Symmetry: D2
Subunit: 198 residues, 4 copies
Amino acid sequence: KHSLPDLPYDYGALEPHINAQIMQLHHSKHHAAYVNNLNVTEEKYQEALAKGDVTAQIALQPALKFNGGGHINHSIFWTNLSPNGGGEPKGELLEAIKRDFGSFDKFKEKLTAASVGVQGSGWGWLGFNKERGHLQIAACPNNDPLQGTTGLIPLLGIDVWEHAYYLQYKNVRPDYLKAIWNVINWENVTERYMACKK
Amino acid sequence: KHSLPDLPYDYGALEPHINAQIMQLHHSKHHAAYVNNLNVTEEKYQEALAKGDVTAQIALQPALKFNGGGHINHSIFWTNLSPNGGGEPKGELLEAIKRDFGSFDKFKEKLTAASVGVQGSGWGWLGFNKERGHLQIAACPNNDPLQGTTGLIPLLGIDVWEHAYYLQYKNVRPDYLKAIWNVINWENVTERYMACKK
Amino acid sequence: KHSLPDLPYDYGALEPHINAQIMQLHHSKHHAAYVNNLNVTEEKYQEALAKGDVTAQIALQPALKFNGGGHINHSIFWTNLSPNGGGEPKGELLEAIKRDFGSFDKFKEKLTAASVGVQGSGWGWLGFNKERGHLQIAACPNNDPLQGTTGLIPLLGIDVWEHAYYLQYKNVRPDYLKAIWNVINWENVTERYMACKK
Amino acid sequence: KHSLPDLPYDYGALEPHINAQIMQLHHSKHHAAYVNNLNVTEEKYQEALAKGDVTAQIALQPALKFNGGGHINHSIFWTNLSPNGGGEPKGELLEAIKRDFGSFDKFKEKLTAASVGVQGSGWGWLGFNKERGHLQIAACPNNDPLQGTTGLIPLLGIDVWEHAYYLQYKNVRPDYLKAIWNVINWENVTERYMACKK
Ligand SMILES: [Mn+2]
Ligand SMILES: [Mn+2]
Ligand SMILES: [Mn+2]
Ligand SMILES: [Mn+2]
C-alpha cells in the first residue's frame, strides 16, 4: 500500500552537482528497498496487532522506524531538489530565514555544520517549530524521521549518508554540501513553509 | 483487549520480604496504568496503521514499548513469586544452573550484580538463549521486554525500579535483592524452563 | 577532588512540601554516592589517560556520565529549592518567561508536562539557549546533565526519579510537582539567568 | 600520542576483492582523521580533568568514543586482512568455531547475517567471551569499539560502513561480504584467540 514515488526530474537533471549514477542508485536501489521492507514490516505489524502480541510488536520497531523513516525522508528529499532550482528563497521564507539565523548566508553555514556534524549515517534539516513559530536546524541519525521523532515540520532536508555522495565526492562531505546548494528547489521549501502557519 | 492479571496470592502474602503496601501500589497503581496506556496506544496504532500514517506510527513507539513492556514484565513477575516459594530449584533446572554458572550460589551472585548494576530504572533477568541452548543473565532498561529486545526467553525476572522496593528498603537495593530470594516460586521458573527445550 | 555540598537549609526545612526523611536520604545516600563514584571513576580515567588505553577510557564513560551528572544535577537542585517562598519571579526572568512561554502559569504547566512525561528515571529542566538567545524546556534521562548533553544552561531543575518523591507522594508524581512550586528559590534561578549575562 | 599504523601490505594488495582506491581513501583519509581527532579530544580531556570540569568531560564523550573507537576498530581491521589466503583456520580456533557455531560455514553465515543486518553504519564481529569461555558474534553501531562497549574481546571484524565497499560493490553489501572471506588473515585471528590465552 506504500509505493516508490517518481522523481520530478531525470537522473541526470541535477548534474554536475549530483552525479546521475548516484541519483539512480539512490532512487532505484536504496529508496526502492525501504518502501519494500516497510510494506512487509507494516503488514507483519497488523498480524501482531491482530493477535495482541506485544512482543512481536515491540520486536518489529527498529525495522518500522528505519524503513518507515527512509521512505518519508527520501520522498521529501527528491522534491526539495530541482534542475530549475538554486540560489535563495523569496517573500515570507526569505524574511524568516533572515530574522531567525541572521541572514541567508548564516543559515547555510548553520545547516552545513549540522549536516557535516553527523557522525555515522544521518540527515540535516531546516524545520519549523510550531510551539513558538520559528525555523529550526536539526540533525537526525540513520533514517529517523524529523517530524516522527522531534515534532518539527520538515522543510528542507540534506541526506548526509555516505551513499548520497561517496561515488562522486568520496570522503569529502563538505564539498558535497557546497555543491548541493545549487539544486535546492526553494519553491518547494516555500510551499512547505506556507502550510505551517496555517 | 489487554487486562490486568490477578495476583496468584494476596498483597500481604510475600511478607516480610515484600511489604504488602508495595505489593498493592505495584499491582493496582503501577501495573494498572501500563495495561490502560497500552490499550489506548495499541488502539491509536490501528488508526495510524489503517491510514498508512508512518509518522503517527513511529511517534507512538516509545509509548507502545514502555506500556507494552511494563505489562509483559509485571505479568511474569507476579508468577515468579509465591508465599510457598523459596530456596532452590530441582531436576533439569538445577542441573543447568549448576552447569552454566558454577553452582546455584554463583548464579544468585551473578543475578544480584546484574540487578544492582542497573543505573536508573530497569530489570534483572535469568533467561534462556535458544541459539546454543544455555541459560543467560541479562539486564534491561526501564520497561524494555527481555524477549522483545534481546530474544532471550524470560524465566525469572527481578524488578529493580525504585518503586519495587523504596518504601520498605529505601536506597538499599542490595538488601531488597537478599530478601527477595525467599519468595521465588521456582516451580514457575521450572515450568518456563521446560517449555524452551521443546 | 569533588565534595558533597551541605544543604543550603535544614533537612526538614521544605516541609510540608518535601519531607525530611526524603531530603536526608536523597542527599546523604544518593548524592553522597555520586560524588564518591565520580571521584573514583575520575581517578581511574587519569590512569587510563596516562596509559594509551582508549578501551578503558570508553568503558568508564557510563560511570562518569551517571555519577558525574548525578553530582551536577543534584548540586543545582538544592539551590533551586528554598524554605523561603515559591510564587512568582520578578524582573528580567519573569519577562523572558512571558516572552517565551506566553505567561508564568503556561510555563508552569509546560515544565510539569515535561517532568511528568519522563518514562523511567530523569529530570525536567528550564534552561537558557545561548545560540538562540531564549529560554526553553527540556527532559533528561537518568542523570544525564543538561549542559553537557544539550548545550542548554540549566536554570531550574526538577528531579523526577522515584527516590525524589515516593516515600511521600507514592505513585502520584503530579502531586509532588504541585507542591514543589511552593519551595522554588526564584532568587537562585534569576541569578543563574543573569549568569549567562544579559 | 596516538599514531596511524602503516598498512601491513600494499593498497592494491587485496584486489580483486577490495580495490586499491577504497583502501587508500579508507586508511589515509578516514582512519587518518580518527587518530587526529582522537589525539585532540584526548588533549582536551586532560585539561578538563586537571580542572574540575565534569560538564566538559561529558561533552567530549561522543568525540572520544567515535574517534577513539574508529582508531581501535580500523587498526585491528587491517590486521584481519591479508593478500595471503582466506579459506579455513586451523587448530584450536577452528575447533572452537565448530563447538560454538556448529561448523565453519555456519559461523561464516551467522557473521554475514550480523554484518548485513546493520542498519546504518557499524561493524560485525567475532569475539571471545572471557566470562562464559566461548566465542560469540556481535554487531556495533558507528565506531563503537567491541571490548569497550561489550566486554567481548575482538578476533575478526568486518567494517560495514558504506565507505568500506561502495566505490566497488555499490549498494550490494552481500557481495562485499562474499569477497572478503578470500582475504581474511586467519593467522592473525588465531593469535588474537590465543591472546586471551587458552
Ligand atoms: Mn539516502
Ligand atoms: Mn515495577
Ligand atoms: Mn535524585
Ligand atoms: Mn571504516
